[PDB]
Each structure stands twice: as structure tokens, then as C-alpha cells.
Design a protein that fits this description.
GO molecular function (chain C): structural molecule activity
Largest interface: A-B, 9 and 10 residues
Oligomer: homotrimer
Helix content of chain A: 55-70%
Protein name (chain C): Gag protein
Organism (chain C): Human immunodeficiency virus type 1
Strand content of chain A: under 5%
Radius of gyration of chain A: 13 Å
Largest sheet of chain A: none
Chain lengths: 104, 104, 105
Amino acid sequence: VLSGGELDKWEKIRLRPGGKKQYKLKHIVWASRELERFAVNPGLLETSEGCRQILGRLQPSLQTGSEELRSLYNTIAVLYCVHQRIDVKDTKEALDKIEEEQNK
Amino acid sequence: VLSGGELDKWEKIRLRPGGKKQYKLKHIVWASRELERFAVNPGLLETSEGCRQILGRLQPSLQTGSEELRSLYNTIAVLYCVHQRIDVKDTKEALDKIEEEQNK
Amino acid sequence: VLSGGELDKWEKIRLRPGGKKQYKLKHIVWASRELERFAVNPGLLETSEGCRQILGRLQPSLQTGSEELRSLYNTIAVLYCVHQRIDVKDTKEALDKIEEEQNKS
């Protein structure tokens, strides 16, 4: 899913703003299993364009989405930023960037 | 999900028109678990507007929906009517009243 | 889902073009359970019209869909062709023939 350089960036990103815990490999495994449970191709996680397609497929479900769906969306937003080489310190900054790109 | 006065109303409502069996607390517990399973926020059951948003989210699936999906929709339609202080005797009257409001 | 005559045709249909493995009853059982998991009425597998409604419900998810979702769609496409008495040798021919029928509009 991620190259060696992308994995180094991934594991520096904090789960919550100002928190200590950071993303791990297991979050990518979890996201991949989650997409399977939602009948979405986990192979889309491998590219920026694939993550964009996943976010677009999930976005109409966000307003009413459970905590599980929101966490999945947030995780793939971070992955999109890592693929795009966008520097983000935490999950919220990636969501900010997703909103900014969509509005552009 | 329901206040004390609302729960008293809930348990007078008949599952079927003219039937003996009536709604119970377990139907609310079940509906909350069902929404989590469909990745919908169960906290939306707590308000009229939240129930309205659930019904709109589920409605495109009704035509081809399984028995489980239709029962879930019907239960939340009754819950919407209870939150709105709309007096209904049974599930069918709740569905009738919601369709007429939608036509307005 | 299928009559006895339909089951005989079903089990002659190849999963892949020119392949050896063929459709089995377990594919119908599996398709029926999959639909329940997707909150779709499995009784719709019993008729041509019901199968058309399922395919229409699933088709927008195909582009981003998992392997499981695509296999389910393809299985139901084959089942639609069997209900319609459309002769198919394999899954790919069933998808092709369904596409041609839609283009007649």
C-alpha cells in the first residue's frame, strides 16, 4: 500500500491533534479489511486516485455515518495526504486538506 | 432514545393493525444495533430530525430491501412519529402518516 | 431459485471462458446469503425481473467494488440469463448478452 518513504511519514502522523499515539501498519490492515466489509476494492488504497475514489464513494454516508464509518473515512484521508506528499501532523489536518482540495 | 412519557406511548403501539403484540424496549435496542451493523450512527434515533435523516438514508434501499431492512425502516418510522407526538395505533398508521407528510 | 431444468443448464455454465470449473448449487446459496448481508431481498433471485432489479441496485457499486461484489453481480447476471432462457457458455458471454439487450433501448 505504502512505499518505505510513505510508511515513514505515515507512522509520524498523530491519531488526534496534540496526542501521543501515531498511525501504525495495523491501521492500514484494518482499513483494508473495513473496505472489504463495505464491498469496496481494497486495492484502491494503493494510489492517490484510488483513495480519492474511496473518499468519494464514502462521502454521502458521512452525515449519518457511525463512528466506524467516520474512522474509516478519516484513515483514508490521511492515506490520501501521504500519497500526495502533503505534510500533515495529525488526522484533523488531513481532513482540513481534503475539504480545501474539494472546495477548489 | 425515548423519554419516560414516550416509552409509555411506544409500548401501546401495535406491531400490526388490529394485532395483539405491541412494541417493546427490545425493538429499540435491536434498531440501534442494526444501524451500527449498517454503519449508521445510532445516536440519530434520539430525535425527530435524526430519525428523518435515517429514513431518507434507508429509503432508496426499500424497493429491493430484505425483510430485515424493511422491519428496521418500519420501526424507525414509528419512532419518528413518537418523537413528533403524532398519535399512531400501529406500524401501518405510522407509515401512512409519514408518506402524507412527505407529499406535503 | 431454479427449477430442475434450469439447474441442469446452470451447472453446465463455466465460471471463466473456456475454463473447466462450472457453476454449482453452492453459488446460488452463496448469492442468496450475500444479498441478505447487503440488505437485499434474496427472493428476488427467483425471477428475471427480480434479478434485473438486483443488478440495477448493485451496478453503481461495481466501479469501486470489491472482488466479492463483482463475483456476486456476475453470478446474478448468469442467473438472469438462465431465467430468460438465454444460452450462455460462461460468465463473460452472460455479461455481453445482457449489455446487448440493454442497448436495444
